[PDB]
Design a protein around this nucleic acid. Structure first.
Lengths: 7, 54, 119, 44, 109
RNA sequence: UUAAGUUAGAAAGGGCGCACGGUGGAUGCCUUGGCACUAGGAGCCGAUGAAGGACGGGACGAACACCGAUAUGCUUCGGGG
RNA sequence: GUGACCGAUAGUGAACCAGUACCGUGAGGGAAAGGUGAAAAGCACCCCGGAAGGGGAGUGAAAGAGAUCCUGAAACCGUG
RNA sequence: UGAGGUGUGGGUAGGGGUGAAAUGCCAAUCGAACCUGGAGAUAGCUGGUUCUCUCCGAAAUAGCUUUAGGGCUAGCCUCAA
RNA sequence: AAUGCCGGUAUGAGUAGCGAAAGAGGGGUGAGAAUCCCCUCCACCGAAUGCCUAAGGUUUCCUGAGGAAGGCUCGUCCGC
RNA sequence: CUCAACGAGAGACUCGGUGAAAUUAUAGUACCUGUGAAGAUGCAGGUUACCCGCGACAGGACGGAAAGACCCCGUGGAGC
RNA sequence: AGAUGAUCAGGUUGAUAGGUCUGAGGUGGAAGUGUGGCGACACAUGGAGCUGACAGAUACUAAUCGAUCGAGGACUUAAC
């Protein structure tokens, strides 16, 4: 996936 | 926006070369002194060319 | 170009009217230097309005002078003071009714202060 | 906003009070562990 | 030679060095008048230390203060008072209330 | 004096070494307290009101300890000067 | 009464007003913090300073011993 | 003006409650709240493992394995008789 | 040498920030005033940014001194 | 937007007062072409470059922040 | 000209800025008085009044007194 959704 | 390496002492001192501040334009007051910065009323005697105007 | 002095235009007008009237009563005030430079032209323009002495110049000056008492136990307003004392005092002099004398910097903010006086 | 702790002394004394814990053996064991550790405040 | 030490007055040392680097090496008659006009509000504290040193030269040794000159003008650091400033999202950043030792030594030229 | 060459010194500030200081509580001494046990004793206190607390009591300001409107205490019997 | 047990980051969490301060509604979690000198003899008095803090003069064996106060390292900050 | 908002006093407690149903909420915590114990759970996994010198010195192969980055025995190393 | 624990101190750096929204002048105190007090203008809220009264806090209320630390600056002022 | 141009206020800029944080092996920290754990500020060859700052931009430092969430493994777990 | 430095025009044998006067441009017929109307309003005085940075005159005001930096010129060779 490699989704950049860092919180 | 994050420092990669810490600044060394010598680089910090080289950057602080121009951080110093200058001597003001201070001159002899003709009434009493000493001394009086240029183009301002003297804080001691309250005179300016040359009346006591406070 | 005139200065903005860090204020809104309405605040600029109100502060300039306050400083002009306060210079007109107390005859010597101590402000910052740039406020003095912005104030002196307005003050000599209002003295020039007081020079004419007619009703229209007085009604022009009434739109700028705030309603504070000038002379105690006489009930004299500032607007009467322009047309009674200042205009008769500066009848011969053509301009240059104020001078600015600089003081040292202020303690709290380093602001260069100045003495304003009617001469 | 409205946070978690909304203080009320009656609710505090009704839920965490001395007589609430003395009314069951569970709170009696709570007070026994409180006395055994030596805490100055035994209950709310 | 006379010496006056401030010893834990509330001023950061880096701000005191900005005056002390230029006051160093001058005659004491041309040193108070520098401090009066800078303004740099650590300079009243440096003035107090300087007048203390000149008075210690006049009273304890009689060194004829019109001939004095500043010899040693080092600034040291005192103990730091630790304060905490609340930030966004509960960060609790640290604030250092710095403290300096101001030392002025006067002597003959 | 000209022309062509060759060198030193330059420090706004900095580097290294040395000297003199400040911050700090590591180290070294050092216990006022702890940790294991040994030889003995003691192993229960309470409706004749327990364990534990709150509130108070000193000429004097708050707290620890002590005491309980007889309140920083009160008797009797011994020790001691 | 004894340790081929510890010595203040160790040893009980706690050598110090410690299950205290503080955190949590609550059950509960839970610190940091010893050392002047033999004797306070704790710097009378003078000067600068509003005071704090200094420099002399005294007490002290030592004042660089002066209230987190024995010795005082290094990181760090400075002056030549 | 209503399947309305809101105050006070109460009730339902975790293999549970509550849910006009989202795996939502139950003290900034939720496909199973928090605290204390079993408990120093276990980890074929990752990281770390503190003074010096001398002598000798590998392997990354085979077989088997719920075995494939683990293990056991052979192969290779070292010391003694 | 554990994204180790505790304590101290740097780098970033005299950098970001100093937290909605009007101040100006003249007198007073004071060692020190843009920030404290008084006066005169000007401005803001005004189904509130006004009055009181719960829950809650608990002395924060008043007077006289004080300014170390806390007022994200100063301070002669304060809910210190 | 074609296609952007002015004006007002707050920050940014200067001065006075106060003053952090993420990060950080040491660092006197150029470019091109190659080489190399196969994508170099530090290696090789060459080309350039007096020392120290201030205001801006963000291409790189496989930038920082979270022992990748995807994929696989564990004879790990949990929910259905 | 410009964030700040810097640059440029100038510092009392002088027009650098402000004020004053006269103009350019802008806006459009100020206040007061009088006339007509019951009045809202219109007309005359009057291209009036007002005018921020645009010009030209004018030292009336501020560019005061002052202070700081700044070289005594190395040696050979051919003619002087």
């Amino acid at each position: 996936a490699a989704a950049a959704a860092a919180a | 926006a994050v420092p990669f390496r810490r600044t060394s002492k010598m680089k910090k001192r080289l950057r602080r070369t121009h951080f110093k501040l200058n001597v003001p334009g201070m001159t002899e007051c003709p009434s009493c002194g000493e001394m009086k910065l240029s183009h301002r009323v003297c804080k001691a005697c309250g005179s300016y060319n040359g009346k006591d105007i406070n | 170009s005139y200065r903005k002095l860090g204020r809104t235009s309405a605040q600029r007008k109100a502060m300039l009217r306050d400083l002009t009237t306060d210079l007109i009563i107390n005859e010597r005030i101590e402000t910052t230097e740039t406020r003095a430079k912005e104030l002196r032209s307005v003050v000599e323009k209002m003295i020039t309005l007081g020079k004419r002495g007619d009703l229209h110049a007085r009604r022009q000056a009434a739109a700028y002078i705030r309603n504070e008492v000038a002379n105690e136990e006489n009930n004299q307003d500032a607007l009467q003071k322009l047309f009674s004392d200042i205009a008769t005092r500066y009848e011969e002099r053509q301009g240059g009714y104020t001078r600015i004398m600089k003081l040292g910097p202020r303690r709290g903010d380093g602001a260069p202060m100045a003495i304003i006086e009617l001469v | 906003m409205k946070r978690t702790f909304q203080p009320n002394n009656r609710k505090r004394s009704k839920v965490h009070g001395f007589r609430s814990r003395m009314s069951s053996k569970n709170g009696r064991l709570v007070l026994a562990r409180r006395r055994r550790k030596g805490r100055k405040v035994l209950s709310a | 030679q006379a010496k006056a030490v401030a010893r834990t007055v509330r001023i950061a040392p880096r701000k005191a060095r900005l005056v002390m680097d230029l006051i160093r090496g001058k005659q004491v008659g041309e040193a108070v008048s520098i401090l009066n006009l800078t303004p740099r509000a650590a300079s009243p504290i440096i003035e107090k230390v300087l007048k203390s040193a000149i008075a210690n030269a006049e009273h304890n040794y009689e060194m004829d203060a019109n001939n004095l000159v500043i010899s040693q003008a080092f600034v040291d650091e005192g103990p730091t008072l630790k304060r905490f400033r609340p930030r966004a999202m509960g960060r609790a950043s640290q604030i250092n209330k710095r403290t300096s030792h101001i030392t002025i030594v006067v002597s003959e030229k």
